[PDB]
Structure 1
Amino acid sequence: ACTKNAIAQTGFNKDKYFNGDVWYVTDYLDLEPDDVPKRYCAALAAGTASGKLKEALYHYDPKTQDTFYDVSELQVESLGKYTANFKKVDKNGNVKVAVTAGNYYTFTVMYADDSSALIHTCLHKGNKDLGDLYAVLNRNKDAAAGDKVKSAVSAATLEFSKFISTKENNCAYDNDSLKSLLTK
């Protein structure tokens, strides 16, 4: 189960974060660390599409080749804190698994600047028992975490040394598909 009420960034700039561009996960920390693989690739796009706040997700297990995309229309709980009832889609937005009650994640932006971010996400998916998952994001898929975001990790009372990097997995991303999924 999730256990953290993550605090959103003071002064979070939603229009900058939700600008339609792609964020790559560079490092992640799962508080129940056998819940997710030790090697992984994920990315997201975040934006407003026809007035609706949206997020598109991409996951890829670099060892198993398991791939999936998702889209959600996000609901606001408070500035920087969202609830996302997701649908699994193919890369073109065709629905594979429809939105359903109890399939949602929450999403808190703890720190963001134009290039980097720290987020907390709590996934709920059917009767699975999942824990808190923090992610360091960057606009550049290869970027090492800088001082701004690492300081934010410390300010959240987390140890960056415990985060698992995604950089050594040969991750390649379809940026076009994430951007276009925002409209789907």
Structure 2
Amino acid sequence: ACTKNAIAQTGFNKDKYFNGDVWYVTDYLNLQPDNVPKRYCAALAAGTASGKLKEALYHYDPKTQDTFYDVSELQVESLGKYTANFKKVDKNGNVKVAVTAGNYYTFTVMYADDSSALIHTCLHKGNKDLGDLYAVLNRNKDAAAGDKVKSAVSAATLEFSKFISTKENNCAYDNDSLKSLLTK
């Protein structure tokens, strides 16, 4: 179940978030914790391409080896709040599972600055969703969450101590593949 109307950052700077670079997930929280694993790697690239907001996603489960990439076109609901489609692709942008109506995610940027961000997403696949997922992002894959993002977590009524870190997984990313997916 999706249960949160996540509030977008006051003064959100869309060009700085959507600048073509990679964001690494450093910490995450699902409000339905059993919906996602406790060991995981994820990253995204976000940018504008051909006049549209795009994200490219990467997921990796270091226990099961499940690996997948997605390309997403984002439509604007309001500043910092988007509805994204997705197509599953290989790392080269070739399609594995096509866009399908009813497969989509909402995406809200709750906080962002030059190095860090806090986002909410609720993923829908037909009549099923993956619950409310929060992620702390950083421009540096290893970086510890700083004071400002932690203030944003607390101002959303969340407890940062409940987030799961991705650090123990020693994740590695294919940054060229991920960024290049923005034009796919």
The verdict on a shared fold, with TM-score over 0.5 as the criterion, is: yes
Q: Displacement of 1:51 after TM fit?
A: 1.4
Bigger shift: residues 136-145 or 49-58? 49-58
The Cα offsets for residues 32-83 of structure 1, whole Å up to 9 and x where unpaired, read as 0000000000000000012111000000001111000000110000000000
Deviates more, 1:37-46 or 1:126-135: 126-135
Cα deviation, residue 129, structure 1: 3.7
How far apart, in 2, do the equivalents of 1:41 and 1:14 lie?
25
Deviations along 1:87-140, one digit per CA (max 9) or x if unpaired, are: 000000001111111100000000000100000000001343421000000000
| Structure 2 segments unaligned to the other structure (5+ residues) | none
SS of alignment partner, residue 136 of structure 2: strand
* Contact 2:62–2:169 (Cα < 8 Å) also in 1: yes
Q: Distance in 1 between matches of 2:96 and 2:127?
A: 19
Identity %: 98
Where 1:168 maps in the other structure, the secondary structure is helix
Q: Is the contact made by 2:7 and 2:108 (CA closer than 8 Å) also made in structure 1?
A: yes
Structure in which a larger fraction of residues adopt helix? 2
What's the CA shift for 1:181?
Answer: 0.1
Q: Output the CA distance in 2 between the equivalents of 1:29 and 1:129.
A: 15
> Which stretch shifts more, 40-49 or 121-130?
121-130
In structure 1, how many angstroms separate the alpha carbons of the residues matched to 2:96 and 2:142?
31
TM-score in terms of structure 2 length: 0.98
The count of aligned residue pairs is: 184
CA distance in structure 2 between the partners assigned to 1:112 and 1:2 by the alignment: 23
Secondary structure class of the residue paired with 1:177: helix
Q: Distance in 2 between matches of 1:129 and 1:20?
A: 28
Aligned-residue RMSD, C-alpha? 0.7
Secondary structure in 1 matching 2:35: coil
Structure 1 stretches of at least 4 aligned residues deviating more than 6 Å after TM superposition: none
Q: Is the 8 A contact 2:89 2:97 kept in 1?
A: yes
C-alpha contact 2:116 2:149 (8 A) present in aligned 1: yes
Structure 1 unaligned runs (5+)? none
Do 2:19 and 2:47's aligned partners in 1 also have CA atoms closer than 8 Å?
A: yes
Q: TM-score, normalised by structure 1?
A: 0.98
> In the alignment, which residue of structure 1 is the partner of 2:133?
133
Residue in 2 aligned with 1:31?
31
- Distance in 2, matches of 1:88 and 1:17, equals 23
Distance 2:147 2:67 in 1: 32
Give runs of aligned pairs for residues 143-182 of structure 1, distance below 5 A. Answer: 143-182=143-182
Partners of 2:62 and 2:128 lie apart in 1 by 22
Contact 2:122–2:129 at 8 Å: present in 1 too? no
